[PDB]
Design a protein around this nucleic acid. Structure first.
Ligand SMILES: [Zn+2]
Ligand SMILES: [Zn+2]
Lengths: 82, 92, 201, 109, 97, 83, 97, 109, 92
DNA sequence: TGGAGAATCCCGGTGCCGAGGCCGCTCAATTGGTCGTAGACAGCTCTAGCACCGCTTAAACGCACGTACGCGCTGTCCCCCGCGTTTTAACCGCCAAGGGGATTACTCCCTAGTCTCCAGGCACGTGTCAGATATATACATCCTGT
DNA sequence: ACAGGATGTATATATCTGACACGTGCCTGGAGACTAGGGAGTAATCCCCTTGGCGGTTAAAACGCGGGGGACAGCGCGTACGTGCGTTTAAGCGGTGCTAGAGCTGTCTACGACCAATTGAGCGGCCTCGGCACCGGGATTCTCCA
């Protein structure tokens, strides 16, 4: 059983994402709240992906299952099959 | 000759509140609500069959589409209501 | 209240009104006017000397009634004559006199080429016609040109039209205008009655 | 001979029509064939959601001391509930109004 | 010694990371997080290699776009640093909260 | 007859009433001019689609269902007027 | 005289207009605006009575929801009055601009 | 006998297939019947849009002194143009990056 | 046996830039772009026939759907290209 | 901390128009039987997912230092709110003329269905050149003291 | 307002290598040639709804003026965050080994489409009464200044 893997998203990694966004100076409480936002995003997408898998009677999650889940929420992705 | 759900919505109201009425303007809003939900579920079930290369819409497609649309506990109670009706229909 | 004096089923016609005397009128009796209000009716135009009990007036009303009913139905002639009679006349008011009047109206229609019999095809190559099969059940129908009766319990193909090149004006115009027109129409009705009487016997 | 006639709704103990729903599915360009149990499942779901809204609307009318439901009462039921608000998140109801809400900073001190 | 003044290096990193197209999160730690979340919905699941890569592409694009809206809110209040209350306002206006 | 300069029909008192229902306590003096610009852009997009539906059906009258279809395409469903 | 202090009447109007469900724009001036705009796309058009009413219902709902987002932006900057730059920020974050 | 065979694309002077598009419309549950001129109209529209994107992408590659098109070049063409940006407003392109942009207030003074 | 638009996209490229290549990753993105636009236009044309109670999809449905989706001058140029092809096809 | 005064709430009596219930009939749902194909079930083959181990080095982590950004306090003055007058246009009845939507039979061309057959497109090898990787060099920008 | 040291970035040259452009063989799907029937266009007629004009009464928009309080700029202070250096740690890469589940055929039966005859449920039309809006009067409460 895996546990406490949310800490893998380190402090230096978050700063790199902010730099590409165009942020110059960062507070000290940003890192804790960013982890919470990311966790909520993944739960919604993964829940729909598993639902497609069970309907097809399979035990492996494929790339097309992820693409269909994203499109339903309004975020189309180009590049991975489709 | 136009069709609507006005007759059937009124029957459900008498089971919940036996002595409450409804106005004509509110009746139109309830009629539009039923048509809107009908197209969401039916449209989603159509794509499930296309992905898996099937030519038939069955109870499995309807059940899966409900879990994708309705949020939280609404989906949990809706599934039990649908399953309960099908088994009773098959027996009789 | 209408000058025809009979009763019409609700589905057959649409009600109108006169502006002056404010009384209900039949739509089919006046030619299906655009608006629901009419300035003057027959009583207003003619005056106190208009006796609605004259046979000519009743015959004129019957002819106009039948023509407008057929035009507004947009389906041609019905299956049987009794079906038409039951459709636009109530059962209680149905007697022998109205049957004779209907026969006279049918004879007049046949005379003016509004209603034509099928020989080998449609009569005209330009004017629109509607073809239907009619089963004859009543007796007393006379074809004008051939001067022969029509057999009972037999079916024939009939043609019907609206814009005949030659038709009488008393069932073609929409609304009456003056008293001279009405008396001319009555004289024409008299002449047609004379012709029908001389052709029947 | 023929043994009477029972509606398919009565065999399932429902109030919403089943025969009508079956026709709409077939003449709607959804799929080539339609199964037998699909109309029964879909009719039950629609009935459940309808009873959910009407119960909350009736409570709002009682609080205002009225015996009829108007569009204002439907607005209050949907927005106060959390599940129904998320479902109808992009829907406008005519003659509905808004919920009373004032920011705290604006109040006198 | 030759110490750069504060803010000079930060501007240099902005130009560097707006010019490349690589991923900015370590691959191995991200994979373990995905498998842990999926345990709740169903047990004994297997993933394709390209399935995990699709999730990481969509996740980073979501976060980068969020920081742009956060930056605008901070300037509207006459500040330079970003704070937690700026993230909350952006999500509220957008419609997620 | 050609209509012109009808944007001024949206008066200053009318805009304040809309703001009060929103929950606004105090208003600046330059809000009124910019609000008129926002409303005009909104109407142009909706009306353009409504006329397109009318021409496809070969009609000269704009009906209520044409407006409902146009709103739904943009993502703003409306309940109450037919539909 | 008995003059109310500034801001007292304004709070009283907020409670009044959040309790009713009527329309807040004069009907006749609004109708003329709709016909003028449609002249560009096609000439000699006719409208149904209920068609115009549908447009007015959707228009007012759009503006009321916009003022709520504008109000939040003003408070974020420690102010009470709303200003044109608050409207522009709300539309930018929302995605219309 | 039979007089050779000409593809329907050649009769219209196009490069995209017409026979294949016709089959997809029929076996797609869109309508009961499909007209004859519909596939020709739709094929021409798809070809026009494809040539529009490829022309802009080729210019970007030339500025960077390369003879191949990579996903980075597609990103630059779409975002710089105004019409194409509005069309693909909710689309993510893998390995695309972002446009260079820095707010003026942050620059040193 | 899988189908794609890779053969046809390459022909168009040689007309615009005669001496430019393309990589495999970029080819996949262009393939997904064509499928996405196909479903938007075809789906919209289906609803137009349903509203007017028709059973056929013709050139008019395709033309109207283009004007609803494409913005600004893209729609103006697309209509001329489609009309030009149909008249040439009818003649031959 | 206390009175005035204005705004809001509560009760009873009238009247009218909209919601609820009944009936005729017609069209859509139900019952019984036939025929053909979509999908359930069983078996097999080989792909790709999972697990483990050793090694090199790049990225993550902890700590010292100090300067720049955030936050609180004070003073100006300008712009918006509240209330009384004067004026303009929305709102409500009534009437009239005409435009355009809806209905129905007639007529003809266009699309679906079927059989034969052969080129256009896909899967599989092969080589070569565009891009990736080091190295030496030349130029532009920051920061402290003058 | 400069000078010069110090650090970071762009440019020209020389070797490798694996991914892309091109050729060959094979077969499945699109084209050619017919026929049959029904889907949509057209002309004549019916009839209601949108548009324009006229007059009167009163609700609402427009204007003016006095103050009050909130927006905005300036200044000072304490500390949280950026920059640089040394030590520790898992990420990344290249192997080896094994088996679960994805993907494809072949057989056959239960299930959904389709047709003819029958009948009852839901739609349109009509009456009828009571739920709610309106008006008038008294009672209660919230704001404001001494
Ligand atoms: Zn009469
Ligand atoms: Zn009269």
């Amino acid at each position: 059983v895996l546990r406490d893997n949310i800490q893998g998203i380190t402090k230096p990694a978050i700063r790199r994402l902010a730099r590409r966004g165009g942020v110059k100076r960062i507070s000290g409480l940003i890192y804790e709240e960013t982890r919470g936002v990311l966790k909520v995003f993944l739960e919604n997408v993964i829940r729909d992906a598993v639902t497609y898998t069970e309907h097809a009677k399979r035990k492996t999650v494929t790339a097309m299952d992820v693409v269909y889940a994203l499109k339903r929420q309004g975020r189309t992705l180009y590049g991975f099959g489709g | 000759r136009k069709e609507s759900y006005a007759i059937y919505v009124y029957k459900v109201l008498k089971q919940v509140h036996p002595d409450t009425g409804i106005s004509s303007k509110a009746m139109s809003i309830m009629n539009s609500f039923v048509n809107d939900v009908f197209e969401r579920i039916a449209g989603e079930a159509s794509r499930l069959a296309h992905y898996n290369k099937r030519s038939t819409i069955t109870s499995r497609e309807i059940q899966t589409a409900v879990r994708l649309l309705l949020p939280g506990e609404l989906a949990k109670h809706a599934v039990s209501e649908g399953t309960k009706a099908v088994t009773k229909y098959t027996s009789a | 209240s209408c000058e025809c004096g009979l009763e019409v089923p609700k589905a057959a016609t649409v009600l109108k009104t006169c502006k002056s005397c404010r009384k209900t009128l039949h739509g089919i009796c006046y030619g299906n006017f655009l608006h629901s209000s009419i300035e003057k009716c027959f009583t207003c135009i003619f005056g106190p000397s208009l006796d609605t009990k004259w046979s000519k007036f009743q015959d004129l009303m019957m002819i106009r009634k039948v023509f407008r009913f057929l035009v507004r139905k947009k389906k041609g002639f019905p299956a049987s004559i009794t079906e038409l009679i039951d459709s636009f006349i109530n059962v209680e008011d149905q007697n022998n006199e109205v049957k004779e009047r209907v026969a006279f109206a049918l004879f007049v229609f046949f005379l003016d080429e509004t209603l034509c019999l099928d020989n080998g095809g449609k009569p005209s190559q330009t004017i629109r016609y509607v073809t239907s099969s009619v089963l004859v059940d009543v007796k007393g129908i006379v074809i004008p040109n051939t001067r022969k009766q029509l057999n009972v319990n037999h079916e024939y193909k009939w043609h019907f039209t609206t814009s005949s090149p030659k038709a009488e004006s008393f069932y073609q115009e929409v609304l009456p205008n003056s008293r001279k027109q009405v008396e001319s129409w009555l004289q024409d009705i008299t002449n047609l009655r004379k012709v029908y009487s001389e052709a029947l016997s | 001979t023929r043994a009477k006639a029972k509606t398919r709704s009565s065999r399932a103990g429902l109030q919403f029509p089943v025969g009508r729903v079956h026709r709409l599915l077939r003449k709607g360009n959804y799929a080539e064939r339609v199964g037998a149990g699909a109309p029964v499942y879909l009719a039950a779901v629609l009935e459940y959601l309808t009873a959910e809204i009407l119960e909350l609307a009736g409570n709002a009318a009682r609080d205002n001391k009225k015996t009829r439901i108007i569009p204002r009462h439907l607005q209050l039921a949907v927005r106060n509930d959390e599940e129904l608000n998320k479902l109808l998140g992009r829907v406008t109801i005519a003659q509905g109004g808004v919920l009373p809400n004032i920011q705290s900073v604006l109040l006198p001190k | 010694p030759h110490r750069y003044r504060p803010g000079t290096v930060a501007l240099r990193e902005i130009r560097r990371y707006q010019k490349s197209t690589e991923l900015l999160i370590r691959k191995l730690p991200f994979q373990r997080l995905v498998r842990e979340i999926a345990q709740d919905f169903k047990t004994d699941l297997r993933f394709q290699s390209s399935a995990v890569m699709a999730l990481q592409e969509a996740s980073e694009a979501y976060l980068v776009a969020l920081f742009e809206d956060t930056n605008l809110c901070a300037i509207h209040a006459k500040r330079v640093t970003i704070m937690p209350k700026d993230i909350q306002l952006a999500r509220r206006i957008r419609g997620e909260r």
